[PDB]
């Protein structure tokens, strides 16, 4: 009766032993020679498989990296957290990458910028670019046929009723596909904190641009004169705002002849709102303050200051050694 149990145990044990010995003697010969750098980076990447960063797929970064050909923030979909994770795996500091959103720099509707010749063909922006360079009255304006919407994989672009595309700030990962896929080179990336943008991609002179569209940049030069910090420049008869030096004083939007800059009059006006606790009545603010909206006598706490008008500025977080001045948006609406 015993042998009926010893026979299958012995047979299966012999088979398992010889097969395991063969597999182990083959495994050491069949050596892959891999490094522990690809397996620990697969859950850090979002794995969206969206080509706007370089190599196809999202499994290509964990075949690269050991060559230094790409930066830590090469993947914009993951963002600051993924960049910091990759940097701390590689052992270096992670930069403070500001989140960016795709934005159209053309505000032209079918009523504002009418066409001059009806178009026949496929409903696409590149196909319209082929047919004698677009059917729009403005040569550089947005066609509105929806190529940027069909390329974006996160469904963050909705074609509006006026023909221009609107980008939802919550669903945009700044992958950069729509920027490359727009034939008119209109789609750009703007920081989320930036509101004052020059929304006209027109390179023509004054009269032609004014005839083509009702909100066209004519390179008059009033916005440059209004700007104090030197952040907006007129090149190729078009205005462009440098987002690094722009402190959002909301003065270029006021002095534009035809509201070419996307902004509203609600800004600043805080003539040195000073916390009473952390200033020693130093009296370094009433001296000039160029427009002279601070003047007082030494200003022992609490500060006796009349608030009537200001410049906005937004730079007085460095003039105070104790940081007593607070900036708050306090205007109409």
């Amino acid at each position: 009766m015993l042998n009926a149990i010893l026979v299958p145990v012995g047979i299966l044990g012999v088979f398992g032993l010889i097969f395991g010995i063969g597999l182990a003697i083959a495994a050491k010969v069949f050596e892959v020679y891999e490094d522990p750098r690809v397996p620990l980076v697969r859950a850090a990447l979002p794995g969206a498989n969206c080509g706007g960063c370089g190599l196809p797929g999202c499994d290509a970064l964990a075949a690269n990296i050991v060559g230094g050909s790409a930066a830590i923030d090469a993947c914009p979909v993951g963002g600051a957290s993924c960049a910091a994770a990759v940097a701390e795996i590689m052992g270096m500091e992670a930069g403070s990458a500001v989140k960016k959103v795709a934005t159209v720099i053309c505000q032209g509707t079918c009523e504002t910028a009418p066409n001059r010749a009806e178009y026949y063909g496929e409903m696409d922006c590149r196909e319209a670019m082929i047919a004698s360079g677009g059917s729009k009255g403005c040569r550089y304006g947005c066609l509105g046929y929806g190529t940027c919407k069909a390329v974006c994989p996160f469904d963050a672009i909705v074609i509006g009723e006026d023909g221009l595309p609107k980008v939802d700030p919550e669903k945009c990962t700044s992958c950069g596909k729509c920027v490359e896929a727009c034939p008119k080179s209109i789609m750009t990336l703007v920081p989320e904190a930036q509101e004052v943008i020059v929304k006209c991609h027109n390179f023509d002179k004054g009269k032609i641009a004014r005839l083509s569209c009702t909100t066209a940049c004519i390179a008059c030069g009033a916005c440059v004169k209004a700007c104090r910090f030197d952040a907006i420049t007129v090149e190729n008869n078009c205005a462009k705002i440098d987002y690094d030096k722009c402190r959002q004083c909301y003065e270029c939007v006021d002095k534009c002849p035809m509201n070419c800059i996307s902004g509203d009059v609600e800004y600043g006006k805080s003539t040195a709102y000073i916390i009473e606790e952390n200033c020693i009545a130093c009296g370094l603010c009433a001296k000039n303050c160029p427009v002279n909206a601070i003047t007082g006598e030494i200003k022992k706490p609490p500060y006796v200051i009349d608030h009537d008008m200001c410049i906005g500025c937004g730079i007085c977080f460095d003039k105070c050694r104790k940081s007593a001045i607070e900036m708050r948006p306090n205007k109409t609406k």
Binding site: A117, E118, Y119, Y120, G121, E127, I130, A131, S132, S135
Partner: peptide
């Protein structure tokens, strides 16, 4: 003159 536009 409202014309039509196509490639070929």
């Amino acid at each position: 003159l409202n014309l039509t536009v196509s490639s070929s």
